[PDB]
Design a protein around this ligand. Structure first.
Ligand code: MN
Ligand code: MN
Ligand code: MN
Ligand code: MN
Lengths: 360, 360, 360, 360
């Protein structure tokens, strides 16, 4: 089977929060099998180098033409060719690798997790981000998610308000939930090391389970110091923009936990290279997301199912924020987890009608 | 006297806990003197590279034939020959060295401790592992051991249950016993560094005296960080798989205490090389065990008697877990210690009847 | 006073080599002043994250909209706003900053070099890359460039062929040229550390003045080792993808010379921050290029004129490779140097006809 | 679908040198598909912890029983189970993984290289070890191998004789061969750092391309020092006894080249994890061997075909030393390379008669 055509479609979907843009890839092979992938990011260029528009432009002008005519079943050769021709562009590469694995799974009749070696579990613990901004509303939401047994691990995005304000807000939530839930924070590189010194202490002292990316990736030394001094473990996220960054952080002792994102590494197979490095170093894992819809979520999920251990769970809740999707199969979230079927490929099929309706 | 024959016998003994397998070595010398040694491990291949079956196979096919015909009284030459021919295989080497020292002690009429240079004590403090799994039962057992003056230092094996559960269990035990007993934990490499960060703090804050091998030996940097940050001292155990590993950990500042096991180093003389390195570096000592019966326990004991200081005592309680033994002389445990006689060799003789009954 | 509109045009120009694609920026201000900039790369995505297509897509969709309406005379505020909304995208940022500086300089009647502080020189030494592939042809071209006094510093791009082959080629050229020219090589990350060990030694012992980016930026430790052991100075180029990378490299001692490129840093002002960091660390400087045409070449030059010292000269020969240009004023190359006028802005005007002709 | 039975057979085959012992694994699956693997070492226990005897003993007693009944198509789950129950035992693990991969490839009709992701080449450069001991004889054998175009890369095993004697021998061979062949040496941990200091210098100055494992793995600091000072690149072989060792060596900068052996890592998939770590650190690669016959050689080869680059080729000449083999298909050595077919599995079938004949 040869790769015949690759299409990159920008889709804007309404969210419960007010819109999420995804780049849906469709790779059609000569044997009639089609694979689907997703390259999605948050806020244009605010959370990475690649925007939806840039991703589509590069796929159309550079990445896709390099693949037309190649064997669809030799994913390693195709991805290595992209590395040779394109520097970075991990989101685009991720969408493409996801589609090739999907097409390959359908072709062989195996779920992507089995193509990657075999799953050691069928479900993944899923965290939820509390985003009402209001403390009372956040505790109310958390208590609801617990009641319906959908989530018991909650993440709080902070760093935008005065430190003292964010600290009170987080400590209040953990204090009210007590031992019923795990509370973590994500600072998204918003603090400088001078602010993180005291903030990490207060959070660690008040039962916050982990602190994700407290300071900017440009401060390597600061990450190493906080890794050694913060009472709560430090998780690296934005500090990882490639597999090679993961080796560097591991060699430096810059974090005790790595967030694994297929978009930041370059696909399901690339994220596994980063996970393996973390494993060889004794670094804990967490399955991250870029707020992908079901396609990217499932592609992440399929790689995470093969991991020996994910000490801190995952935040694969992306599909839950969308009011509408472009696939026919809704994800199964129940009993604090995301359940992944043993269907061929990613186990998803496009809803041609909603796709046409939301595509640009 | 020449080494004439070496036999490796696998023996399965019932335990009070449900079976322990030992590899008993019998080295017969041309002068009619026989030496006995033991090569024992825990759980097949779960706690090391060598299993009872592999140990016997290698002794029979490789190690023993290299020794037949050599002088029984030149232990250094015999052991150096084994190092030249065999990589690793420390458990097998340990059993063999133990038997040669036993035979040499009987021949010269000296206890093995005197062959090793001379004892500075006749008894060793012995810790006890609380293994009921149940907190109330563990406190009850500990109080009994204290009452009968058999043990006042207790070890708790953790790491298999959720961290929070193991922490509550340990803190409850220390809280109830108070200053009447020393409470320590052994995590057996079960935690990753991200989990150990908070767990070590809680344990150190609640009176746990030391934390044995909290994380995997593959994470050297993590051991160094915990050595500098944990409130309770960190003891290395599985991180030591050879004398050379001990030098490496000492040079790195990876632990402030080393567990000394003859099986992991290669015998009573090898364990002394590791102890000497620890001494030159200012690292504290602890006499460890692989749950050996009286033979291996006594061989460990004889080397430990020559040490200037063992700040943390020993856990030479192996014989106490066996319902039946294959030696005639039962070990003397009284007043929190194991008492070692000044009889030739290891001071033990095989019970031919029970040996035949439990051998495979 | 206000930025009214920003246009990003892709232009394909013919080279002496084959085309070269430029992204010409035209910023129109409310006061009638227009500024021009250039964002140019090499080989689509083979030499960087940004392609001409992705650059235009991002400018039109995200960057330009963030600038419309802002004061055209407050460049610091404009660029800081872009850093807040966009991660990376240094090529696009460089093109935009260059245009704003051009407009501001025309507005105050000052060359960009004066806006940046004040020039300390009026011309820059310019190197030339011998790229025929044929040793004899290269020596001939070099002899000619020397004859007409256009260049006396030559750079050989190597790494694509077997090591001994590239080494022979390079050593032969330096042997034939002797003390007449400075010969340098750029390996463009093509060797791994194991190949670079012997190659750097041979090159250094045969009169090669500096070795540019011998290994990949992913291998930080290798750069630090080569920096201490190479007989010829090591220059970092691709290892610098941001000003923060420059700080990191300096702190580590990964190179004794930094190549300065406005495109890899984010503009003329950004390149000065990197140059300042190098100066504070005692690191040597070299004026680099991404093969820009006159607009980009002049924007680099204006920044380079304010530097105290550029120990290794520059390679601002980009305009010399183009057969057609889109500006009215051709660069003044004479006596081994590039001469920069003291006219307002960049001192360039767009040839509207040729622009329309090569614009795609 | 299910692993029904696993057989471990010790086979003694005649070499051109004397015998070579292999442990042939035969895994039978419920669907009638059988997979074959090989766990081979050199010199009993002289070159590793596992002997043919210990390997068979452990497979029969511990490893095989843990696999019976498990899905034959979920190799990741099977191997992770083995890691949980058994420490080390990489040779036995490698043999088992190779057989499961062979079975799975025959089952899906794909060569193992495709199961592992996809090959990027169809043949591998193969080195040859000159082992006559006689300098003149070695030069003759080398000239011949060059004549018939079978090998052009030669490796000399040294370290057993006085240094100046081995140095003379090696330098003479390279002098006589000149630019015609690449000459390398493997010291097999025979020198201590004090001897290696001058030897590495002499070898490097006389055209030796790489120096493999000059000193013992116990001396980590010495490897780091030799890695910075040796004029010829240092390759780690014995220092790698697990994938985690590879990470450690890379983090420390102890070698610029890693020898890859499926037997020392735990199988074809394990060797890829080590290769990935090396790639992320910028470390060069070489395909190593433990002198396996065709089964083991092909299992290594299939993994090596997926690698982006093997800067230093391979030494997969194992089959060439055997006069008799236990498979029906003899390896395709031609034009300095080993050619690998695109047939299912390993592409090998057991010659039941010869197997029965040499089986012990
Ligand atoms: Mn995050
Ligand atoms: Mn222990
Ligand atoms: Mn360059
Ligand atoms: Mn070797």
């Amino acid at each position: 089977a040869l790769i015949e055509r690759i299409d990159a479609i920008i889709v804007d979907l309404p969210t419960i929060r007010q819109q999420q843009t995804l780049v849906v890839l469709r790779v059609r092979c000569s044997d009639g099998v089609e694979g689907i992938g997703e390259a999605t990011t948050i806020g244009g260029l605010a959370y990475g180098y690649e925007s939806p528009e840039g991703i589509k432009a590069n796929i159309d002008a550079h990445l896709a033409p390099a693949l037309i005519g190649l064997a669809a079943d030799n994913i390693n050769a195709a991805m290595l060719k992209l590395d040779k021709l394109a520097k970075g562009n991990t989101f685009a590469k991720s969408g493409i690798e996801s589609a090739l694995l999907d097409a390959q799974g359908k072709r062989l009749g195996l779920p992507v997790s089995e193509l990657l070696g075999g799953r050691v579990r069928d479900s993944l613990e899923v965290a939820w981000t509390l985003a009402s901004g209001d403390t009372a509303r956040d505790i109310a939401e958390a208590r609801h998610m617990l009641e319906i047994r959908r989530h018991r691990v909650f993440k709080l995005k902070i760093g935008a308000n005065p430190v003292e304000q964010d600290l009170k807000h987080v400590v209040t939530i953990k204090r009210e939930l007590g031992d019923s839930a795990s509370v973590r924070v994500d600072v998204n590189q918003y603090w400088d090391e001078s602010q993180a010194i005291r903030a990490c202490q207060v959070l660690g002292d008040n039962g916050i389970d982990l602190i994700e990316q407290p300071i900017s990736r440009i401060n390597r030394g600061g990450q190493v110091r906080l890794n050694q001094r913060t009472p709560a473990p430090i998780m690296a996220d934005e500090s990882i923009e490639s597999v090679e960054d993961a080796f560097s952080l591991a060699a430096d002792g810059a974090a005790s936990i790595f967030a694994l994102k297929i978009a930041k590494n370059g696909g399901p197979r690339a994220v596994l290279r980063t996970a393996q490095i973390a494993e060889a170093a004794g670094i804990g894992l967490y399955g991250g997301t870029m707020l992908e819809g079901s396609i990217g979520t499932l592609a992440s999920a399929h790689a995470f199912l093969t991991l020996r251990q994910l000490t801190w769970g995952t935040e694969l809740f992306g599909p839950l924020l969308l009011t509408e999707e472009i696939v026919n199969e809704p994800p199964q979230y129940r009993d604090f987890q995301l359940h992944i079927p043993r269907t061929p490929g990613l186990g998803l099929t496009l809803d041609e009608q909603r796709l046409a309706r939301f595509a640009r």
